[PDB]
Motif scaffolding. Sequence first.
Motif, PDB file in Angstrom:
ATOM      1  N   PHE A   1      -1.451 -10.270 -13.133  1.00  0.00           N
ATOM      2  CA  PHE A   1      -0.568  -9.498 -12.259  1.00  0.00           C
ATOM      3  C   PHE A   1      -0.918  -8.005 -12.369  1.00  0.00           C
ATOM      4  N   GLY A   2      -1.344  -7.382 -11.267  1.00  0.00           N
ATOM      5  CA  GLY A   2      -1.732  -5.977 -11.294  1.00  0.00           C
ATOM      6  C   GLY A   2      -1.086  -5.032 -10.279  1.00  0.00           C
ATOM      7  N   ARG A   3      -1.577  -3.787 -10.258  1.00  0.00           N
ATOM      8  CA  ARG A   3      -1.041  -2.703  -9.412  1.00  0.00           C
ATOM      9  C   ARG A   3       0.503  -2.717  -9.304  1.00  0.00           C
TER      10      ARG A   3
ATOM     11  N   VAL B   1       3.407   6.339  -5.402  1.00  0.00           N
ATOM     12  CA  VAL B   1       3.544   6.394  -6.865  1.00  0.00           C
ATOM     13  C   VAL B   1       2.267   6.805  -7.622  1.00  0.00           C
ATOM     14  N   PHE B   2       1.182   6.063  -7.421  1.00  0.00           N
ATOM     15  CA  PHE B   2      -0.061   6.309  -8.164  1.00  0.00           C
ATOM     16  C   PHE B   2      -0.832   7.531  -7.652  1.00  0.00           C
ATOM     17  N   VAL B   3      -1.044   7.611  -6.334  1.00  0.00           N
ATOM     18  CA  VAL B   3      -1.847   8.683  -5.754  1.00  0.00           C
ATOM     19  C   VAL B   3      -1.089  10.021  -5.680  1.00  0.00           C
ATOM     20  N   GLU B   4       0.081  10.029  -5.052  1.00  0.00           N
ATOM     21  CA  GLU B   4       0.778  11.293  -4.814  1.00  0.00           C
ATOM     22  C   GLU B   4       1.606  11.798  -6.000  1.00  0.00           C
TER      23      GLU B   4
ATOM     24  N   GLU C   1      -7.408   4.104  -7.073  1.00  0.00           N
ATOM     25  CA  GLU C   1      -6.267   3.201  -6.863  1.00  0.00           C
ATOM     26  C   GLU C   1      -6.603   2.025  -5.938  1.00  0.00           C
ATOM     27  N   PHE C   2      -7.206   2.329  -4.786  1.00  0.00           N
ATOM     28  CA  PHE C   2      -7.557   1.310  -3.809  1.00  0.00           C
ATOM     29  C   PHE C   2      -9.015   0.911  -3.982  1.00  0.00           C
TER      30      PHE C   2
ATOM     31  N   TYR D   1       0.827  -1.214   0.000  1.00  0.00           N
ATOM     32  CA  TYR D   1       0.000   0.000   0.000  1.00  0.00           C
ATOM     33  C   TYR D   1       0.870   1.279   0.000  1.00  0.00           C
ATOM     34  N   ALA D   2       1.973   1.246   0.741  1.00  0.00           N
ATOM     35  CA  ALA D   2       2.845   2.409   0.859  1.00  0.00           C
ATOM     36  C   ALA D   2       3.477   2.754  -0.482  1.00  0.00           C
TER      37      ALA D   2
END
Lengths: 146, 146
Positions: free
Chosen positions: A73-75, A24-27, A36-37, A18-19
């Motif tokens: 395979f994701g995220r 990377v994606f959110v910030e 994202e989540f 999650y960190a």
Amino acid sequence: NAMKIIFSASPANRAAAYALRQAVFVEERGISADVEFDVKDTDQCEYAVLYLQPDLPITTLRLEPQADHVMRFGRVCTRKAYRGHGWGRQLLTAAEEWATQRGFTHGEIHGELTAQRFYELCGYRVTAGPYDEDGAPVVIMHKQLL
Amino acid sequence: NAMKIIFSASPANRAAAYALRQAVFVEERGISADVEFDVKDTDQCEYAVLYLQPDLPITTLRLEPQADHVMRFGRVCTRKAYRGHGWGRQLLTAAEEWATQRGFTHGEIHGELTAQRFYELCGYRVTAGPYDEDGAPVVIMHKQLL
């Protein structure tokens, strides 16, 4: 201190995954956090994480089993300072072997158009697209696992 | 005079398939002709056509083989006066059997979102999407052939 790879749904490994994704994606890239989540992020979901040290996760992916022995395979993402040194590729090569051990025969990726060549070097091929979702181009890719 | 089904690349059968597609996609629904008719439409391409009489083709699909024993069925359409009587479904059931005879193990459809349920009744399931192409929503569907 050796490099280590972990596949599991534990609080600690889940936290590492999650960190990385939050940074990377959110910030860094401005994607909405409720995008994202998602509903697949439960206590039971397994993540793959590569650690240089026990306090230093650097790359990750999410395990998303599908029907008919296909593993998606994701995220997929890598800590910024460590990009471009082959770590993501190392993780993926290990995740394929983990999946075959559990009876999956095909890998599946829904990648950004810009990553097509990267996945082709790893042995994937386009089976559908390009299209568009969440605002940008995607391609559907598959690979036979051996 | 029995109903008849033909699978082939002949001038006559090819003509039947083009005439159906020109009437439905280009004229009735306003799709651009250089979009409907594409680089896959060669002398070597095989089409499936259902005839009530020798001068009366009523429904058609295009045979589009893919890698790894997957058959894609495309350019699917039915003459307007004959829609809603199960002819398309009859054609597809015959095309699946034709494909298995030639060693394909999976059917593949890139259908309009509005047709999802229809294909589910025939045994297909969504594996990707919805997305968007040429301006409207599509879903990627697969079925194991037996």
